[PDB]
């Protein structure tokens, strides 16, 4: 026995599934702009089941919330609307947190019921390269101390809190850095998806995803994370190395046989530990494991019990 | 800008409950078989009201899981029944947890939503005497490694995981240690409440905090506490440190002068300390924030927005 329902692609085929939700022409190819590693098939077939089961929970915490109000008999103090949904998405760089992220964002603002559904990056939530510089943190940066954890929950916080405002900054990975002054504004949105590395990480206190509604991770063998890891870094020799203001401008002119040997090395020093010490912990965290194959298909989905 | 919606007791009581809610014979009867002088209005004026809100959330959590289990089209390895819904209540040794928990598993009890609650204090899960000796703990009994947490955990897994069965050791407060053989027995009741004052602690992965559906903490002030406390210890020396066996039978013998300096320095020392340390940072974490006057009274709710 296990605090997990487990379903693999087989039985996750078997569909019982009593609506047929129907994905119309426009949104169909347009959740094309936000992939690459995302058929139209594993939409089709697991991102929307998936999207359904979340709205349940988002309706459901909706009418908790109203039906709580109108036993409090609508006081003052109250707030008029349900606060913000808030759901947490994390697993190792590479493992494609960014596009489940803005497949969900895609598929949960389809329903009348929550329309407006904001996408946060914890990346934003780095400390900006002097201060990591200063603290000695460069070497480290994706490990927990490399952010502003005390920023971070002032945000959620300020997000669950039901604030028409709250901003976060904004991180480049073109520039490695914080960009300064850049901000984004979240406006009470009726769902927020919250996406980075150390959204599940635990701490001494309160910690972000004690104000998660639902949180998932992104899963795959480690073998596999890492094969998908050098290959985008290959690819960013293209583009994002390519260009002279990137940080790693430099790292463009290595052959692919070069350029492999220095991603098996980042990742061997850097970010595999990173997903050993910190990210593979808070697997069993979420909501929603689901794991991946080689070849970015959703293999296994782990449903905690309700 | 505060996650929480606030009430004072004037505030609650003024509250326009749209039913009426009232106990009967025959309901007011058993609540004095708890008896510990225990305030019945407060039971009425505030713990029947304060389930109702929660019956409200277990009642959500039972309609969502058929609402994901139809939607799912009933696979066989979905469990038919939701699994319990665990309710941690933290706080304090001296706060009064148990009495809180002990009404509100009476007054959650009458629903027919519900019937079936129970009720384990995280005491049997401290490590006996014996095994406390051999790691240099009896200084910090009450204090997390105190306790054996692997088991704690495995115990509120199984019971999450909607086992049929799960068993869970048994603590005497009169000899000041675990009962051997001694086990209570939970068999999936629709509700279990799991009370002690580290249910709310944090761990670096999954953590007993991560299974429960809603939590209380129960607060006041310090030095309110500390009060109740010493009350306590006197008022022991008539009761559980009579007895010529019990651990602290020489107790039963200090003047009133004596057994408040005894009280007064154990406070001082062992409980005021794990309270500012290990129990006092769990309190945000809970979903209800009860405070306490120092007459026993609460004043003050803080429940989190929905
Ligand atoms: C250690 C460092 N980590 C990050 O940049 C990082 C930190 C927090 C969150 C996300 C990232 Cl990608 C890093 N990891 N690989 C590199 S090479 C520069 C960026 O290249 C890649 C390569 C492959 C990827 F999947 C993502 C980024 N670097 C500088
Ligand atoms: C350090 C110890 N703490 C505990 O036994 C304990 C540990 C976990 C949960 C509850 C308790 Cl009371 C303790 N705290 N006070 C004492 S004196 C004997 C127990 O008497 C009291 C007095 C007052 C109380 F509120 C509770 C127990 N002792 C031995």
Same mark, same amino acid.
């Given at each position: 026995?296990?605090?997990?329902?487990?379903?693999?692609?087989?039985?996750?085929?078997?569909?019982?599934?009593?609506?047929?939700?129907?994905?119309?022409?426009?949104?169909?190819?347009?959740?094309?702009?936000?992939?690459?590693?995302?058929?139209?098939?594993?939409?089709?077939?697991?991102?929307?089941?998936?999207?359904?089961?979340?709205?349940?929970?988002?309706?459901?915490?909706?009418?908790?919330?109203?039906?709580?109000?109108?036993?409090?008999?609508?006081?003052?103090?109250?707030? $008029?609307?349900?606060?913000?949904? !808030?759901?947490?998405?994390?697993? +190792?760089?590479?493992?494609?947190?960014? *596009? =489940? @992220?803005?497949?969900?964002?895609?598929?949960?603002?389809?329903?009348?019921?929550?329309?407006?559904?904001?996408?946060?990056?914890?990346?934003?939530?780095?400390?900006?390269?002097?201060?990591?510089?200063?603290?000695?943190?460069?070497?480290?940066?994706?490990?927990?101390?490399?952010?502003?954890?005390?920023?971070?929950?002032?945000?959620?916080?300020?997000?669950?809190?039901?604030?028409?405002?709250?901003?976060?900054?904004?991180?480049?990975?073109?520039?490695?850095?914080?960009?300064?002054?850049?901000?984004?504004?979240?406006?009470?949105?009726?769902?927020?998806?919250?996406?980075?590395?150390?959204?599940?990480?635990?701490?001494?206190?309160?910690?972000?995803?004690?104000?998660?509604?639902?949180?998932?991770?992104? $899963?795959?063998?480690?073998?596999? !994370?890492?094969?998908?890891?050098? +290959?985008?870094?290959?690819?960013?020799? *293209? =583009? @994002?190395?390519?260009?002279?203001?990137?940080?790693?401008?430099?790292?463009?002119?290595?052959?692919?046989?070069?350029?492999?040997?220095?991603?098996?090395?980042?990742?061997?020093?850097?970010?595999?530990?990173?997903?050993?010490?910190?990210?593979?912990?808070?697997?069993?965290?979420?909501?929603?494991?689901?794991?991946?194959?080689?070849?970015?298909?959703?293999?296994?989905?782990?449903?905690?019990?309700?």
């Amino acid at each position: 026995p296990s605090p997990y329902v487990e379903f693999d692609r087989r039985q996750w085929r078997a569909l019982r599934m009593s609506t047929p939700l129907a994905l119309t022409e426009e949104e169909l190819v347009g959740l094309r702009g936000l992939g690459e590693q995302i058929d139209l098939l594993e939409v089709e077939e697991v991102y929307l089941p998936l999207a359904r089961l979340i709205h349940l929970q988002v309706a459901a915490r909706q009418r908790l919330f109203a039906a709580t109000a109108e036993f409090l008999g609508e006081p003052q103090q109250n707030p $008029d609307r349900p606060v913000p949904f !808030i759901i947490g998405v994390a697993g +190792s760089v590479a493992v494609g947190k960014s *596009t =489940t @992220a803005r497949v969900l964002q895609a598929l949960l603002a389809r329903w009348d019921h929550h329309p407006r559904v904001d996408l946060v990056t914890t990346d934003g939530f780095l400390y900006p390269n002097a201060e990591l510089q200063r603290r000695n943190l460069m070497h480290r940066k994706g490990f927990p101390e490399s952010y502003n954890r005390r920023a971070l929950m002032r945000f959620v916080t300020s997000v669950k809190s039901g604030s028409d405002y709250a901003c976060a900054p904004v991180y480049s990975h073109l520039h490695y850095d914080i960009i300064p002054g850049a901000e984004q504004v979240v406006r009470h949105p009726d769902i927020l998806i919250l996406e980075g590395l150390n959204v599940l990480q635990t701490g001494p206190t309160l910690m972000v995803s004690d104000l998660f509604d639902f949180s998932l991770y992104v $899963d795959a063998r480690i073998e596999d !994370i890492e094969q998908w890891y050098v +290959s985008r870094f290959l690819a960013m020799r *293209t =583009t @994002a190395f390519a260009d002279p203001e990137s940080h790693f401008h430099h790292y463009a002119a290595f052959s692919d046989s070069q350029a492999v040997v220095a991603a098996r090395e980042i990742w061997r020093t850097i970010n595999r530990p990173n997903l050993v010490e910190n990210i593979l912990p808070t697997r069993p965290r979420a909501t929603l494991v689901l794991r991946k194959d080689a070849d970015h298909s959703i293999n296994r989905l782990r449903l905690r019990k309700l």
